Design a protein around this ligand. Structure first.
Ligand SMILES: [Ca+2]
Length: 276
């Protein structure tokens, strides 16, 4: 199937090797039957772009799982919204670890990851569009979440710093995602370095929001769900596979050398789902 004139350029970009944008997003899986765990501010599950496919399954803060920020709804939309998403029929499963202003703690994030590792329904992917300072406990938790069978996509971060200095971006088993722009530039805020595995569209990404509507925002938070969604397409297309197999497929099939302004020591690779 082909979505003509997708409402976010990020979808357009990941289905082709070179600019110019084709104003189209082609997909041959929808990720049906794959579970995508959005570890974030929760999901506004009633949004029309989710159909009936979004349900919150855990809240680390003692709340009801519902998004009261918008960020997690936006991220969920890029993973799996009908109009805004990469994997348009995936099951979206909200894991609320951040509050109404988009913040939390290392321990609440680990609680959400622990829930997903224990209770995920295979085949499963997880998206972590969040980060903080380096934490050995958070990195270990991320490594064991991936090893439990959940492909793990994490944001490199928006601090213009080395992602090896941040967690969970620096975890060995993460697939860590930097942000590009619609001209294939490195986004000015994007973290960089040897702990980044590839770029994905991150600046001015349009997706779902709290108010029933849309929002266009920027960040490695927006790049990461393109990768999580592609991993969900992978599992629906080929069957379940380990995080290391899918990560290797992503980086070897990524578009090489098109990012401008890349920071030397960072892979010049851009997410490319064409070969699915
Ligand atoms: Ca395209």
């Amino acid at each position: 199937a082909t979505q003509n004139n997708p409402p976010s350029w990020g979808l357009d970009r990941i289905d082709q090797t070179n600019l110019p944008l084709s104003r189209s997003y082609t997909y041959n899986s929808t990720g049906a039957g794959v579970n995508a765990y959005i570890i974030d501010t929760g999901i506004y599950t009633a949004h029309s772009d989710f159909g009936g496919r979004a349900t919150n399954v855990y809240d680390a803060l003692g709340g009801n799982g519902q998004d009261c920020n918008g960020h997690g709804t936006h991220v969920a939309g890029t993973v799996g919204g009908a109009a805004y998403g990469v994997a348009k029929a995936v099951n979206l499963r909200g894991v609320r670890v951040l509050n109404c202003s988009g913040s939390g703690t290392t321990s609440g994030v680990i609680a959400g990851m622990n829930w997903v590792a224990s209770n995920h329904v295979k085949p499963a992917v997880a998206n972590m569009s969040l980060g903080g300072g380096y934490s050995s406990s958070l990195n270990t938790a991320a490594n064991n979440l991936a090893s439990s069978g959940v492909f793990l996509a994490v944001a490199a971060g928006n601090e213009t710093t080395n992602a090896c200095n941040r967690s969970p971006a620096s975890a060995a088993n993460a697939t860590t995602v930097a942000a590009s722009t619609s001209t294939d530039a490195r986004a000015s805020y994007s973290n960089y370095g040897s702990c980044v595995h590839l770029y994905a569209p991150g600046s001015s990404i349009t997706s779902a929001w709290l108010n029933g509507g849309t929002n266009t925002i920027s960040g490695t938070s927006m790049a990461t769900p393109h990768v999580a969604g592609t991993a969900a397409l992978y599992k629906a297309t080929y069957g379940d596979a380990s995080f290391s197999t899918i990560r290797s497929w992503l980086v070897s099939n990524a578009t090489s050398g098109v990012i401008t302004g890349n920071v030397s020591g960072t892979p010049n690779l851009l997410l490319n789902k064409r070969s699915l």
